[PDB]
Amino acid sequence: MMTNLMLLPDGMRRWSQKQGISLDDSYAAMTDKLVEFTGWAREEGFTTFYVTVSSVANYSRSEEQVTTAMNAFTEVVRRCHDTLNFNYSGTLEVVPERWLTELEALRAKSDSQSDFTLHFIMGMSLAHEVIGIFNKFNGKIPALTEELLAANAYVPEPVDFLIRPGGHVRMSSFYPLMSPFAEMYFCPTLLNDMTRADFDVALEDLRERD
Amino acid sequence: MMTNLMLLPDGMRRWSQKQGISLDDSYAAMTDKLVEFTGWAREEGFTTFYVTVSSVANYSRSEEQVTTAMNAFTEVVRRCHDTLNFNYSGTLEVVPERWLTELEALRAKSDSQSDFTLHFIMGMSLAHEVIGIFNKFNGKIPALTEELLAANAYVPEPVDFLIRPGGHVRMSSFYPLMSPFAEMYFCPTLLNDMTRADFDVALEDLRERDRRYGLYPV
Numbered sequence: 001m002m003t004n005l006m007l008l009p010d011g012m013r014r015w016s017q018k019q020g021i022s023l024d025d026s027y028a029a030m031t032d033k034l035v036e037f038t039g040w041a042r043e044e045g046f047t048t049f050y051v052t053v054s055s056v057a058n059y060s061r062s063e064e065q066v067t068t069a070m071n072a073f074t075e076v077v078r079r080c081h082d083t084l085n086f087n088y089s090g091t092l093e094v095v096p097e098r099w100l101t102e103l104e105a106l107r108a109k110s111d112s113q114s115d116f117t118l119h120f121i122m123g124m125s126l127a128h129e130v131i132g133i134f135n136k137f138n139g140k141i142p143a144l145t146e147e148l149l150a151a152n153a154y155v156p157e158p159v160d161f162l163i164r165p166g167g168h169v170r171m172s173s174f175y176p177l178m179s180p181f182a183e184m185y186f187c188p189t190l191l192n193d194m195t196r197a198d199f200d201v202a203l204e205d206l207r208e209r210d
Numbered sequence: 211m212m213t214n215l216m217l218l219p220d221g222m223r224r225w226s227q228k229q230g231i232s233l234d235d236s237y238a239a240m241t242d243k244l245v246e247f248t249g250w251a252r253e254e255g256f257t258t259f260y261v262t263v264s265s266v267a268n269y270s271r272s273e274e275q276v277t278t279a280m281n282a283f284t285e286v287v288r289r290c291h292d293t294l295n296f297n298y299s300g301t302l303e304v305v306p307e308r309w310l311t312e313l314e315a316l317r318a319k320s321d322s323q324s325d326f327t328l329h330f331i332m333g334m335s336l337a338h339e340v341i342g343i344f345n346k347f348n349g350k351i352p353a354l355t356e357e358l359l360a361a362n363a364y365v366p367e368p369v370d371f372l373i374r375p376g377g378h379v380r381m382s383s384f385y386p387l388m389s390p391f392a393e394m395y396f397c398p399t400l401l402n403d404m405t406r407a408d409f410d411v412a413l414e415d416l417r418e419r420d421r422r423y424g425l426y427p428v
């Protein structure tokens with residue numbers, strides 16, 4: 001029975017400024033924090049933990065900025081893939097090949113028998129998502145159905161809860177297409193400053209709406 | 211630089227409970243409030259004021275509830291259409307045809323030369339929107355382009371700012387397809403309790419935000 005959580009990581013540049021460290025070191029703190037967060041989500045019973053790694057727009061950051069971020073996200077998977085199920089999706093054509101190749105090999109040997117999945121979405125953008133689905137089925141089916149759309153969306157199931165730390169109240173190209181009933185939670189805390197208590201009080205807020 | 215604004219109306223049933231009045235009278239207050247809000251948005255220089263009238267799910271309400279709501283939204287347009295440009299879009303097949311006929315007549319009588327547009331989206335639901343676009347172009351084009359998608363989405367441009375009163379921190383069926391970087395503002399105030407000051411401080415919050423569009427500052 002799916003119960004799933006989506007995180008929109010944010011605040012690494014601001015944290016690097018706050019701490020007086022490089023962007024690389026802030027993204028290293030992000031890797032550590034996302035491993036923590038993945039374990040919190042698993043402990044809390046979520047069946048999939050979705051992490052929005054990147055938008056299409058993000059890949060127009062500088063080459064160094066893209067490498068910093070993509071390496072830091074991939075390092076989460078290097079550390080976790082042997083003890084959870086790893087999957088990924090998105091507008092893969094904008095993801096630099098080096099990261100796609102590495103993430104695919106990690107996916108291929110990840111722990112497929114795990115009841116818990118870490119799922120990365122890369123290159124998020126509703127317009128690119130819809131264009132890809134259209135082009136796959138164009139002329140090949142009589143009509144698009146809700147089932148076929150759900151089976152081809154980047155996020156493969158409805159998202160129950162979405163958390164965005166870092167102070168910005170916006171989706172920034174990360175909205176999950178097939179989640180009309182998702183509950184959203186925003187907080188100012190930068191991702192790298194989030195504690196388990198911060199996560200727990202976010203879940204109190206999210207769970208106490210229903 | 212030009213900006214637009216979208217409002218997600220919410221809170222009519224709770225307001226009827228709070229005020230001790232019928233749902234119909236709460237929707238009458240909503241009509242009054244939306245006429246106010248439309249004027250505030252125009253005064254603030256927004257090019258278009260978008261109102262998310264309904265989701266597809268809304269049309270599973272009772273027939274009386276649907277008529278009450280659709281009449282109350284249409285009354286907004288009856289009152290203001292003569293001095294602005296009115297347009298509408300959405301999953302129109304789920305809207306009872308009476309309202310489509312009246313709204314089309316009001317659009318025809320509205321001021322197409324106006325520098326301000328009131329735009330209603332009805333039957334919002336991204337799955338239905340996408341399915342409608344697919345079925346329109348299926349087998350008729352070699353590939354879907356961003357340009358064609360933008361020209362056929364319910365909301366005809368990216369939305370800069372959207373406001374959701376009523377306390378729910380969620381987008382329901384109302385997230386605008388072609389707005390990756392819309393700023394969202396939520397507040398607990400029920401729509402029918404919102405004052406001009408409430409609107410003004412929402413705009414302070416929205417306008418102060420640093421919009422980055424997925425990039426870092428240069």
Ligand SMILES: [Mg+2]
Pocket residue numbers: 010011012
């Ligand atoms: Mg950021």
Ligand SMILES: [Mg+2]
Pocket residue numbers: 220221222
């Ligand atoms: Mg409501």
